[PDB]
Amino acid sequence: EPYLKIGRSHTLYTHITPDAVPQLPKECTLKHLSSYMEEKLKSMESKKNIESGKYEF
Amino acid sequence: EPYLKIGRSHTLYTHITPDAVPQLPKECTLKHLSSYMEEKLKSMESKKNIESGKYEF
Amino acid sequence: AVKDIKKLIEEGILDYEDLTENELRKLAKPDDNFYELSPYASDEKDLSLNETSGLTNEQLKNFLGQNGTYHMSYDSKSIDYAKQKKSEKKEDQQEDDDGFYDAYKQIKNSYDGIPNNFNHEAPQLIGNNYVFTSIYDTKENLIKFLKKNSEYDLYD
Amino acid sequence: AVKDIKKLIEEGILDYEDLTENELRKLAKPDDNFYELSPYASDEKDLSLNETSGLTNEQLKNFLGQNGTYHMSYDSKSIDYAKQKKSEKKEDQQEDDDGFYDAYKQIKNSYDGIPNNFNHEAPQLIGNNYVFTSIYDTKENLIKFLKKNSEYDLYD
Amino acid sequence: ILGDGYINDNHRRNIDFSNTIIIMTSNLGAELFKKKLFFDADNSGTPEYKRVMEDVRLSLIKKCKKVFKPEFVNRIDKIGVFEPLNKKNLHKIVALRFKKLEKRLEEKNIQVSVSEKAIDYIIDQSYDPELGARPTLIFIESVIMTKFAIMYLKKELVDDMDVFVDYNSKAKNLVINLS
């Protein structure tokens, strides 16, 4: 919704600055999506076939 | 620590001389790390076929 | 409060807000695994270097500099040649994971100042201070603290 | 005090500090294995010579001489060609390690004036005097003595 | 076999793998158990060298699924990954050999004791992290154990001798004997 409003607007392209562009939310960046894979792929292997450490209670 | 201080400093690059750059300690050079491999490798190759008679009690 | 003491207690007891300037800078100092001598780095597919790259032709840069009614904006000789090799190798069985897993590992390390095969500590400027982060010791709680608290504040 | 006498006693008894000018220069003189005739050198991978090298193109040197907004600073034709050969040979079993030991080796011989396959004595200027060092006879204790004592002193 | 306890034969008999501990070993150790990632296991880590093993153990399970056709990654219960040997461990691992050694000498009643400094003389002159202590156990048998019998050939071994091994740091080389 905010990216189509500035896209359809009659503004010159030299006036489009990074101040005038609204930021994506934190779910939508590469910083989240790359770190979310290490929440899976590192974790996915660190609980496949390995279950002696830190299952104390 | 000393290499980031001169790196962040507002000095022109023509003023950066080898006198103005602090030297690395002796653990951190190629002269140590190449000689440390001959302390391993050269010593190691003789770990096969340990000499009979060279160590006499 | 010293460096190994903080890794156990500050997760349980101590907040980062009550720490002195000589205590914050030493937790951002590199550990004792730094200055430990370590040969034999492990090679992997370097996503940093592009094997399909080429040189500035300077007649493309002239013709693409004069903007208007051109339909392709690169050379496509070294790229096409590369795609032909992947069609001819018949290597699939783990390369179906290599393009699809391994970048996440190296792409996230690009946000921490860490290159591809670098299993050691690499700095990262936050504000006016450097924080040495690792593959393992990410030091993420220091990064959230120094960005939020020291935005308009200075603690060396 | 002669040359073979010093190799046994100066490790046990004699310090280098009490040695005359005609005694220091003769221990830096080459041994009797020098002037002994020896054919048949043993070939190895010469890390000195670069097989992936090329010629100065003089249109790259002109375009890279005009500094600014270029993105690759070499030719990359001969160095990609080389990498394709290592992908096609399937030689792994000792190339995983013969090179590794060799790089460390031949690299240390570069700090002693000794080239790659040179099993003999090679000089090294220390101060104003030459010291012939070997693969085996490194003569390291002479090098530590002539650098420290004869920094502002002269002993031929 | 790792799936169920049964396999048939050419008789189609019921082979039973229950009550049989099945043990799968292989190396897969090059390019990560090397000097790669494992310099100075002297320290060996209460909080840290665990964490290197917290990815080195992961990196093998990458090579487990992509070499073994990963149904073994499904069938096997516990994938055990050994730590590299510490020099603090070999003070007793070598000493675990002398108790097995005297079983071949309890007929003759030679009791053999080794100083800790003597072990340090052995480790630094026989051991590396890369060969895994097998030639160090050849270093015992082919260097030190050869002349205990030569101490016995010529009559310097009474059939009760308290053999005390030690090195007094000159690179001098002595066996201290008590009756």
Added chain:
Amino acid sequence: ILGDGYINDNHRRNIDFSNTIIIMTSNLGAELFKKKLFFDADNSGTPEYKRVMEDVRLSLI
């Protein structure tokens, strides 16, 4: 066997397989799909990504 019942032995007698539920199991999915937008799908897509699994199913045939 799947086409006919009448199967000769090495005595060349017929061995019926009527009233025998024959069950054919193999994987043929291993190390080649591995997400297909689905192994990260516990919700799995109730009207949407079921059609993906149909196109997954079609590919196997």
Added chain:
Amino acid sequence: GNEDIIKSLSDAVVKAATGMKDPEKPIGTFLFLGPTGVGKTELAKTLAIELFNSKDNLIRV
């Protein structure tokens, strides 16, 4: 020639005749390598002359 090889032959006999370590491993396996010409067989022919004084204990396969 090659006294270091000859000592390794003698040491296994010292491991043999003295009641030293003999598991089911036979005493002193050896793999001799060298250029064609040098004393590789006739170490062993002198063993049967000296370890056994018979020369008919030598078993050439």
